[PDB]
Amino acid sequence: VRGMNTSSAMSAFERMEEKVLMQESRAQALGELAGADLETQFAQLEGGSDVD
Amino acid sequence: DELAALKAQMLP
């Protein structure tokens, strides 16, 4: 309940930090790919195709 | 200038 450093609590906090950091890192890598125009162009074509 | 050119193309 306390959330104070503990054998189980400390491990959980460390684990939580690592997954979140990894997700953020993955997103940053993903963002660079997303930023490129070619990826965006494909999506626009796809949307038109989807409606059809 | 490129944006202006694009607009001209868009009008046609």
Binding site: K19, M22, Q23 | -
Partner: protein, 51 residues
């Protein structure tokens, strides 16, 4: 009888605590599975990014 009442009360409190404790570990176990799933997704992203 007084001793029995005290023992029963202590046992009931312990049982309630155990149930709460039991609920907590299960949630943690569920969280661990969720955490594992997140990790697997990250690994997939790295392979995709390089290519």
């Amino acid at each position: 009888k007084a001793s029995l009442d005290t023992q029963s009360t202590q046992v009931e409190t312990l049982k309630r605590n155990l149930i709460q404790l039991e609920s907590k570990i299960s949630e943690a176990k569920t969280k661990k599975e969720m955490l594992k799933a997140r990790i697997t997704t990250a690994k997939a992203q790295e392979q995709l990014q390089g290519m």
